[model samples]
Target chain A: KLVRLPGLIDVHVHLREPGGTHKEDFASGTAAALAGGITMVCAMPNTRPPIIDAPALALAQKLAEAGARCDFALFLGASSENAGTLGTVAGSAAGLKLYLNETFSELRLDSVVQWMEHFETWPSHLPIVAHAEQQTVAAVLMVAQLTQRSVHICHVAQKEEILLIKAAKARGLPVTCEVAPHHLFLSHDDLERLGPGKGEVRPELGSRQDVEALWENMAVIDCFASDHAPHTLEEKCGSRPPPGFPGLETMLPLLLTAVSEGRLSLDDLLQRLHHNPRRIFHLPPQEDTYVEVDLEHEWTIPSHMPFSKAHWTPFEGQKVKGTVRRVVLRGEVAYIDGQVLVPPGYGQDVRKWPQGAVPQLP
Target chain B: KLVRLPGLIDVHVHLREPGGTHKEDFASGTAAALAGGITMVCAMPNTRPPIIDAPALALAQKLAEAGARCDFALFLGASSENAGTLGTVAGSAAGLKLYLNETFSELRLDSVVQWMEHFETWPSHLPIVAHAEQQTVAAVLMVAQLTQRSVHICHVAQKEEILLIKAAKARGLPVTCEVAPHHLFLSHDDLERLGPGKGEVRPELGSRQDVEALWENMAVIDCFASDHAPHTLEEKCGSRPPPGFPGLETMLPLLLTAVSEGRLSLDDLLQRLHHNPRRIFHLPPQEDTYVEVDLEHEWTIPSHMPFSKAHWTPFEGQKVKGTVRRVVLRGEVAYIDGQVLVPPGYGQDVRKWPQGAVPQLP
Candidate 1:
């Protein structure tokens, strides 16, 4: 049997804290991530203090290391203050995060102008990952173009954005992007129907044209990551509260199932779910980096399967094909044959290193 | 004992036909209207052959006449190709619809310019409804200003849009806009979850600022409508179709339930639900129109209770505060005590006057 390729990485996620721990914490988010075949879950730092400096990053890292059931990484929050000394945090995080069109943080004008400047002042090799959208997409695209940095767009959701990135790529500019399952599978039409539903996120779903643009730009997107921002159902289903549907556990199965249904591809699925993490995380060619599932196995998603305390998920009754039978993390069985063989202490903390050497050299 | 004010008019909805009707048609969508305390609904004309010309309008009108369960009006589609002379269709429908950055007979650049010119030339008394967005808002505002014609914005989705309209309203320009429950209740965060899910639609959900903008301009929003463009799980869930979640059945309940939860007020809900429609639709003060409902009824939404044939609903299982006991249409019991009482051929078709009502009101 193919003992799963080895490890998986999540380029995007959120473990809310500071003001909102009752919803989810570092331990629970990463625990749920492991249960879903993830070896690592990279968190966006916009917590109460907003990971603006080394102390904030170190604090989140310590908490996550102490509590996480799986490997945890962080994306440093970007602003004018930090953008000036961005190199100090560059590769210090999975990438730089800004909320140009996003509402979750106080990231706005300073974040935008500073992001452009950060590109110019920072280490030339760092991947400037961004939360791409109308405002954010514009911000990163401009930074990538003006500063001539290889910018990676995270969680791309709209059609116009695909074109924007494509145009950037066509210019021989170094720009890559990641598209989430939600953006690929859902649209604004779905948001209105859910009723006090999951549409509370900023830079909401796009129009049909937006979706088509996503499909149209599929070729250029360098990675696919689940911006697995989780929130509890009790909190999300009400009239007044933050909006975000929990979705970490469902990411792999949902995409694999989409591939089976001909919406995506087997290659696309693997590249996004596995290989793209290598690209976005700038991970070294280590001994482990993939997961293998029995494509033929048919199983129904468990009604109450969650690793994170954020128990709300949009895929409540969805039945899909191709289950993740085994996951290899760093040359060990993180999860195998529907059982978790790796204990909570097996996970590791990752950091930046010089880009790795490839084994496929002629 | 007190009746809800004015005729219930839902200005936004998708009754797909001449294409993708397995999901929803005029008949089923309007049946849902009766259930939601909506005596009338304005069907969107973005179907096959598109509602771009008088011929399409004629076809749509015929379909509504044959199948629409309640009184109905329509917005003539404005695409680049056929934006000219849409006023002819407007005479039959509610008004001409502008597609600035949309598909399905998407308007071209020259045609968008011409369409804006057409709106400018429209008789000031005639109201033209424009889908509020970055693309349409600018042109719609320009034409409305230039022609000095009364304009109604369809589904205002952002705070900037609210500010624009507020500024315009403050200036006493002939600008009146509508906000859907989606805009008032759901923000961009909520939309990301649903758009990729079963229920999704366009003019995608706006950001938190958008919600803030909507809240800020609540008094200025002349009306509220449910752009309930229902599509089937197949048509909407897949990658090809437009995103639209059904709203007819849940529109009033969701708003009233919000009221019950103390998120809003009974009077504000009334303005959004009734008084505004009365003013926009030119209903006479003596035209008895309202729904009687138990303001204190508590019920868990059943997935199957709606009168519409669409198997899926965006607002399914939502526990709401009030229930529509009976709907009165022109002094007659149209819907009674949580049941649709209006039989076939029982409802009146909204009559359109020539050249529209004169824009005599300030």
Candidate 2:
């Protein structure tokens, strides 16, 4: 019944390109994104060689331009040593992503002061996203409060962290945060059901109470970031498994289902998935960018039917009520009714959108 | 220093004998019980042949009498076809254990009315413990409301279930519930952190909120029943994983740690672990049958160090704030500082405690 809504925008995703092609390349990742009714996505720079400099950004951009199935943007990584490079690529890259915790990225830092020092003179309008959890998230907010700089936190997975965000917002701090789909839809119970290794994720799967807190504070949460970092099936199930999994294809449908179930409102879902991300990242409006969904269609995400090379989703076996029926990207039909209509390279580079063209809400 | 209170009585436990001897015989099970400061334990009857008839109850009692290391009572199992047998063994057994769901025992039923019909004429003085969860627990309470019979719920693991118990108690319907030690200490987060097949227990580990609700409704929760189901470590990690793990040695210390942390009062702890169990189950006060504890001794439950034949515990890496320092059973020291001071068979047959002997509280 629900169809032809605003096309979704996800500010956080990982295409695993520039390296780790076996896990996911830009083509496969974007294809999955399109299927989930996402018209645009910002790929993180945590790949093999990492996208810290202008050269690496340009090279990664070229690769996406060759094989991307939807509109795309790429972020420049920030490390303790790469403060000088951030200002150079500020105009070229989509935004800056700093890893406050040790994930697969090599851009690691040990102290909050070190992180604050790295992005002291960043552009005001362009977003600076932090991949921080628990204490790290609290510290980031403190630093943001001190410097009066806007910071977007990724995959916040605790009740105390959400409380910190709410407090920061009340104080009129420029703080916005995003929650991953798994963090909202799944909890420690699902991990127990799936067993030890199956439900592992970075930011570590939070408790049911933590999830309830996320729903309670959805009014403060800014965007739905897939954090679609993918690792191979073997790696996830094997010893010493890596944390993330393929999430691009499940993000929107899950949130839409939440809307349909009255857990969240459709207006709020659209605002979080589309309007807020566009405003936070200053993404320009693209023509014919829309998606349709069968709001009443209840379906379960099937295992091993993924469009990404990762070929797995943490949302596997979870029942969802909404399904994306069509997705159009920038005047072209990218995906339709579970089928990808457009080939690779049809997607245009959505790297930069000047602040002058920011959309004014009706 | 809280040296000694009332000796602890555990109304729920699984001492596998008659069929599951390798997992836990009565000797090993009672030894583990003494080590945990539990002087009296009611062993469930879901063993190999199911302790339903006079001969099976006799056999189980003989096995326990020959090797039990502490005071013990045997529960008689009830199935749909065995309503007639309840009148026969109700006098000899501790109480009737109704398997409302399929767990280990092959006999399973679907209706609440059927379960109530099977035990409608039983003695009101004796307890009727049901292994039901969620709506099943509510249904059991409804039946108890209609029939005016007291029902003790085993392994309650939900917020709604506790709410139901609270409401029934307010209405003065005879309803009492017991929570497992694992339910209070281990949440679904532990399962997630440990991965699949690791923390699987029947009525499976509930959410942190559910556990909090259990603690909140401690006024109605009658006893600390260690649903101490055990299985081999190899079987637990193997393909067909059993649902529960060993818990006898950790129940008291875990609760004491909760008390030590100010989550519960010493009076509340004594009431739940000793006083209430004695009053509800008609367990008599045994002279010198009390255990001593170092209330401030912080320790983690060690791995590969269980007195049960199963030789493992789910609480391997968990930190407990209080430790059981000594245990006395029936005028003699049974265990002291983790050592079994008394040999097997020192435990007397705790077949029946006169209802007249129920202790009068100050």
Candidate 3:
């Protein structure tokens, strides 16, 4: 199939709402995703007060349900202070999100190990997702030690880390990784140009080697996630501490460029982008909300034209080969052209722990 | 000497004067540099109207002299339209700046080489300091081939280019390079923690390998210039860019940290930082202003307090093992115990080209 299985699921997307909607509200963000051929995108749980708990998860679910363009799943974040929530946090997410660094919350190296043990003593099988480069490797080994099983790493940008995760997976210590749109499209080369707009993360752009590595190890990498945490320009311009860049609009275009570069194949790209993420997170398979593409439709992206309210994409002015022909949801075409047919808030909440028949709780 | 060279020249700092002063201006920015131990910091000419010619350069010098806390030098930008000024561009300062791949000008890949050749013929002795990572490697190599005899690259963040420049230097190519503080202090590891806060450039945070390459290839990389371009929270936080992070204050502390880590020796660090720009630009040895350090005064940086008036630095929350005790300017005490003794406008312009240095008008 040129398009393949049900639909693509972006495990990490930020449709900021309620708390911080000025940058990217659920309506605009989801609309952007739908227009970009993504059937669903996972909204991050780091709102005004993070969605680390079940009540927060419910509230997040409510927001996405009321105003998302596609189906969504949120990964629950855990820190040392919330270690006690480990017993219940898994219920609120596909898995527990351990930051492995003191980024959003105080999740660190030690907390990740402790949280992995939470899976060891759990009543059912749960995947521990780590937002780390080195720490995720440690988490996989910890998972191997605890459940004697596999783990998932959120946003794996470094190439060597992909091989590490792949090796661990091959060694029968289950591990999965991801790469965001920025990692796929930009590298340190862009950083040299960003001068100051380096708005994604630290080591903001990986090396060409990092990009090549992402291309080389695309097969073992799990799926595509945006890690789209939105913040207003007003909120994100500090040198030391700026908010993150939004990528809902530019995500697919960058991937399509990867396809043009011959660094990736259609099969491997779709597997990580769609199928594997659905299987890994146990996200409910949506038959109606699927994207079908001609795959050969070539187009040049015009500047400042996107469904996202951000009005800016780092991938702007870039020439991408593939185009999103139609984004369908509920068997109805939701997005065509650069505009959203269904508007935002047409998205639904995703079910987690769909581990063989009975899904987990919240 | 407790402080080594009291006066150091930074040819790559931004004193965003004449136009946008919200992020930082000549006064506060120079104050930040002097407070951080820099004696002479040059301002890039990419302000509102931009310093594209002799008139603009003289205007910038005037503005800088009027408000500077420490001595200043200014670089004139030569793009497509501004290339005509190469005859007078080398007057009064270190070099001509060519923004090959920047939004500041429309000087594309092909035209930069001609500008380089034009700069090559001027024979004023001021090197053409091309923004190396401006365009594609092809475009960068275009300048690399122009045969300037005194070509210096600003903010070389990529690794492969290091080898290219190394080979160029090994071949006795006149090209040398300067790196920014952000490249040395952080890497891809920071992306996980900093997220959008860290992505200043489009490529975002590059990998650890790039930093390692930069530290290892310090011989070819001759200077540690601070592109201390500051932006208003509004400009940064606005719907989009005009993006960059501020770095004058944090430049010293972070460099000291890299030095202390054995990443780059004191000699390499100092040579690149204090010595190279002095010798390369043929500027006099700086003795204007600088912070005196114990060389081992450990301190934990507060989360949000700044002497730079920008109110933030990338090194915040980092535990550093060095401190700036006092500051001196032109053999006089300028700052001690966090008090400014050398008030604004106390410093003079440090442009010391020989009389009748370059030919007059055509």
Q: Report the Cα lDDT for residue A360, model 2.
A: 17
Q: Candidates' TM-scores?
A: 0.47, 0.49, 0.47
Inter-residue clash pairs, candidate 2: A195-B195, A195-B196, A196-B195, A196-B196
Residue-level lDDT of model 1, residues B59-108, one tens digit each, is 77777777766776777765655544554445456656665555334443
Ranking by TM-score: 2, 3, 1
Q: Deviation in angstroms for A87 in model 2? A: 2.0
Error of 2 at B156 (Å): 53
* Candidate 2 C-alpha lDDT tens digits along B1-362: 64654468888888889898888888899888888888988899999878887888888888888888888888888776777556755856778888887676765766676777766766554678898878888877777767766788998888888888777654445577888888888788788665567666788888999889887776567677888888888878788788887888888888888876878656457657765675456554565466777777787777755587777787888888877788877678788876898877887666553321211111
Off by over 4 Å in 1: A1-6, A17-19, A110-112, A286-290, A299-304, A337-339, A352-362, B1-362
Of candidate 3 chain B, the 10-residue stretch with the lowest lDDT total is: B353-362
DockQ of 3: 0.01
Tell me the tens digit of each residue's lDDT in model 2 across A1-362.
44566667888888988888999888888899888888888889998789987788889989999988888788888877777556656856678888888776779887777777856766544668898888788788777767756788998888989888877655445677988888898889887666666677788888999999988887568787888888888888889788886788888778877876768656457657775676567564555567878878888888855588887777778888878888777677778777898988887666543321211111
lDDT per residue for candidate 1 within A245-318, as digits (tens), equals: 56677777777677667675554554565555664454543344456665556677664564667765666556
DockQ of each: 0.01, 0.01, 0.01
On a 0 to 100 scale, what is the lDDT of residue A308 in model 3? 63
